[PDB]
Design a protein around this ligand. Structure first.
Ligand SMILES: Nc1ncnc2c1ncn2[C@@H]1O[C@H](COP(=O)(O)OP(=O)(O)OP(=O)(O)O)[C@@H](O)[C@H]1O
Ligand SMILES: [Mg+2]
Length: 530
């Protein structure tokens, strides 16, 4: 007998029979002349009508270039209007976009291209070298958004196409539309098949309903400073933004000053961040010199964030609801979303990752028995609903091990749900540090380290130890100014925690490695230790 957790919100109608473009643009007529994409680099504004129009032009363009239903294009781009136009244009065709980290090595880009069977790679001149030979040898066309050197087509060859030249197409709910990849935090990146049905479901779960979990409307301005090739931005910023008619402000590269200025300048109202952004915000002393009163909702997604740091940043946006969302590529991606974001906001506790999304079921399973758990007990987070992935790309066996025959997705994440239906993430199961019979969550310690005014960044990993099995160790970046000592660090931790959570060694460093998508690269630090 499974003990099953659900949202405090009612189930709603989800039109997951509609293709993604059709769902996203369903209500476009009520906001057609509102800004859709704001290019922060050049101040250029595309209206809702511009964006549908360019997307339809690109679809027609892709079709003339040989893109057929179920064919794949690769997007190898930084955030830009053209990323959007390509993604949606492929969708118009019943085709598929795979999205690649543009700072990947040539071996990486090629592997992804081979695996996804991309017929076209849409990128910039600066990356052409990565895929030049491979493309020629495999009749894969290369289209550049900026200038098109030897053998490449320019993106304009897509936008020259006529919007009324999109062919008749029969799109199935279960057709793939997106091939995002996991961030590779725990190993090589995995290709994930996301469907029209999955993504419409997941966008609806967030922004539709009488009382939506994530309340966004056509007068909001959503900042987009996270990579759209990761599923958190593409879904919760781009697709959710389109669905409700919000302006999407496109930044390329976060730095705290640029960030604050653009927020002020463009009157951003929705801030979809990650813990490294929140960390920056909490440690900067100048946040107070800026007019951030417009910001009404601040989300942190993508990675563990502790309550003390979350609270620090809370105090710096007294005008906003601040809270967390929890996503996993394999999950569509959103599994839970802060209810302080709802149109009729619920109460929340600091440090929760949210409450499981409506129109879904969640269970917490102990991984040593396999039995589901009651409230306030730590186990493996599981989820079932229409939003989850069709499966891993070219890997039905891993899919089968990951989503069981009951249609339960097993995240590999440990968590508990408390009496208020808030979810808390402990850490990734395999990241739990094994000190005798005890299990230590690296993220709990990291949260406490980040609390120290003289610490600017940190990561906790296990070390090989003779009699304990593994001991917790910490990598610490000192603040500018301070010369905090190893023993100062250890004693600071020691005063606050139960004995088996103590830090055995601290190593001072200049930086902690992180994915572009905002997750600490713990494995890279293990390798430094080994
Ligand atoms: N709010 C959150 N708090 C804690 N962890 C989170 C939160 N949001 C996401 N995560 C973590 O991020 C994961 C989703 O990350 P993603 O799908 O980008 O790949 P990854 O797990 O980071 O890397 P890979 O699967 O390639 O090892 C979740 O499984 C969870 O472990
Ligand atoms: Mg993962």
């Amino acid at each position: 007998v499974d003990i099953i957790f659900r949202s405090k919100l009612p189930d709603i109608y989800i039109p997951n029979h509609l293709p993604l473009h059709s769902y996203c643009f369903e209500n476009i007529s009520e906001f057609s002349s509102r800004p859709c994409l704001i290019n922060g680099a050049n101040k250029q504004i595309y209206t809702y009508a511009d964006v549908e129009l360019n997307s339809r032009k690109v679809a027609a363009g892709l079709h003339k270039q040989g893109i057929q239903p179920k064919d794949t294009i690769m997007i190898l781009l930084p955030n830009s209007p053209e990323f959007v136009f390509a993604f949606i244009g492929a969708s118009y065709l019943g085709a598929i976009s795979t999205m690649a980290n543009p700072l990947f090595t040539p071996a990486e880009v090629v592997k992804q291209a081979k695996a996804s069977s991309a017929k076209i790679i849409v990128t910039q001149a600066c990356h052409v070298n990565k895929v030049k030979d491979y493309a020629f040898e495999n009749d894969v066309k290369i289209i550049c958004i900026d200038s098109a050197p030897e053998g490449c087509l320019h993106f304009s060859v897509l936008t020259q196409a006529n919007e009324h030249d999109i062919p008749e197409v029969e799109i199935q709910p279960d057709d793939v539309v997106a091939l995002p990849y996991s961030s590779g935090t725990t190993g090589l990146p995995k290709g994930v098949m996301l469907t029209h049905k999955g993504l419409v479901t997941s966008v609806a779960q967030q922004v539709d309903g009488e009382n939506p979990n994530l309340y966004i409307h056509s007068e909001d301005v959503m900042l987009c400073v996270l990579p759209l090739f990761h599923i958190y931005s593409l879904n919760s910023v781009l697709l959710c933004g389109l669905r409700v008619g919000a302006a999407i402000l496109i930044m390329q590269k976060f730095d705290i000053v640029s960030f604050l200025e653009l927020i002020q300048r463009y009157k951003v109202t929705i801030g979809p961040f990650v813990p490294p952004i929140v960390l920056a915000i909490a440690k900067s002393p100048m946040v107070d010199d800026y007019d951030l009163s417009s910001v009404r909702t601040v989300m942190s997604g993508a990675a563990p964030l502790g309550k003390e740091l979350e609270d620090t940043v809370r105090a710096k946006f007294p005008n906003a609801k601040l809270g967390q969302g929890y996503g996993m590529t394999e999950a569509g991606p959103v599994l839970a979303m802060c209810l302080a974001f709802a149109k009729e906001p619920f109460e929340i506790k600091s440090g929760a990752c949210g409450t499981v999304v409506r129109n879904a079921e969640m269970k917490i399973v102990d991984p040593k028995t396999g039995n589901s758990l009651p409230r306030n007990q730590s186990g493996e987070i599981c989820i079932r609903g229409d939003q989850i992935m069709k499966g891993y790309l070219n890997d039905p066996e891993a899919t089968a091990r990951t989503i069981d025959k009951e249609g339960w997705l097993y995240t590999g994440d440990i968590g508990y749900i408390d009496d208020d239906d808030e979810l808390f993430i402990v850490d990734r199961l395999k990241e739990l540090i094994k000190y005798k019979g005890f299990q230590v969550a690296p993220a709990e310690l990291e949260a406490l380290l980040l609390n120290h005014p003289n610490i600017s960044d940190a990561a906790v990993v296990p070390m090989k130890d003779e009699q304990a099995g593994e001991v917790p160790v910490a990598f610490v970046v000192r603040s500018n100014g301070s010369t905090i000592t190893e023993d100062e660090v250890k004693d600071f931790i020691s005063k606050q925690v139960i004995f088996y959570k103590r830090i055995k060694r601290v190593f001072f460093v200049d930086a902690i490695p992180k994915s572009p998508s905002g997750k600490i690269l713990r494995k890279d630090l293990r390798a430094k230790l080994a």
